[PDB]
């Protein structure tokens, strides 16, 4: 159809985030590309205001699930692409176990031929010497299942999952995600059956990037419907 045809090949991506965590303000810009035929995302971000005040891994989920690979038998369950090119609003609250929380609102939509994710993030109530503001998180990422259900009343979807952030002392800090996606346009979207996205990420550094930065690779495939 229309929305899914926008994703048949490689699509450039722009990411812009303004954040405020415990009054510490910052901005991030990122760019790369997505290829939903492979379910693959590649991005590089820089903090344009200096040092990022939180660990980079805690922003991974905030920094475009329209690039998931949906198998052909599940095509009618791909809300994200069906809302394009007009886009969708992605809102989250992220609860870090025994620590603060992020509240994010993003617009994901096409601006020309580029898919753009513009985000506002506010974090509150973090312990200034917790795992987060104390940068005790390892610079890595694990695999998670992203659970999706329709929210017919709001003409969108509800999404939730729990991220495992490995800590430098060998423990794990859980980040509990609650997400709702709502279409920006008034065109019709696909309201899916219950399913999930199998996601995997890897983080690295660009040895020639002098600014505080993250390189992110994500693989995302939809499953859970025979």
């Amino acid at each position: 159809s229309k929305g899914e045809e926008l994703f048949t090949g490689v699509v450039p991506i722009l990411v812009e985030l303004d954040g405020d965590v415990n009054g510490h303000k910052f901005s991030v810009s990122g760019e790369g590309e997505g290829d939903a035929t492979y379910g693959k995302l590649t991005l590089k971000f820089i903090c344009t205001t200096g040092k990022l005040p939180v660990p980079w891994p805690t922003l991974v989920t905030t920094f475009v699930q329209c690039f998931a690979r949906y198998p052909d038998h599940m095509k009618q369950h791909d809300f994200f692409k069906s809302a394009m090119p007009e886009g969708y609003v992605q809102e989250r609250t992220i609860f870090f176990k025994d620590d603060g929380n992020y509240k994010t609102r993003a617009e994901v939509k096409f601006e020309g031929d580029t898919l753009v994710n513009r985000i506002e993030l506010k974090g509150i109530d973090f312990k200034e010497d917790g795992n987060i503001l104390g940068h005790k998180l390892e610079y890595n990422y694990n695999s998670h299942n992203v659970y999706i259900m329709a929210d017919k009343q709001k003409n969108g979807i509800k999404v939730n999952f729990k991220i495992r952030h490995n800590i430098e002392d060998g423990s794990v800090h859980l980040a509990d995600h609650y997400q709702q996606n709502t279409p920006i346009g008034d065109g019709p979207v696909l309201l899916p059956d219950n399913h999930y996205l199998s996601t995997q990420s890897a983080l690295s550094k660009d040895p020639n990037e002098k600014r505080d930065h993250m390189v992110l690779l994500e693989f995302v495939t939809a499953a859970g419907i025979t």
Partner: nanobody
Amino acid sequence: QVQLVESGGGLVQAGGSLRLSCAASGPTGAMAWFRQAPGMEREFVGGISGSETDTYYADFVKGRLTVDRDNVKNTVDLQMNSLKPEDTAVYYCAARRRVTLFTSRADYDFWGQGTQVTV
């Protein structure tokens, strides 16, 4: 394709000042200056995002330099103060199609041919 035309530079001695300028054939995104000392690796000096809202200078360029940009003329300019003999190098204008001011040379799409600066 997009071509970058460098001018300025040349010979100075310590303490002096020098100016470099770069003119782009067309409009572009982030613009930056790099330099490459004789057998060293190309390092980022300073630049301006395509939107001009982000300016970044390397650590060694302290407050000694100023980059400005002109999206109508499609030019980025660099001015150098308090020159030291370690500033001797071949300076390169660089630009990207896209807007973000990354600093790795691999992120840049268009290059000038290199302008000698000798302090």
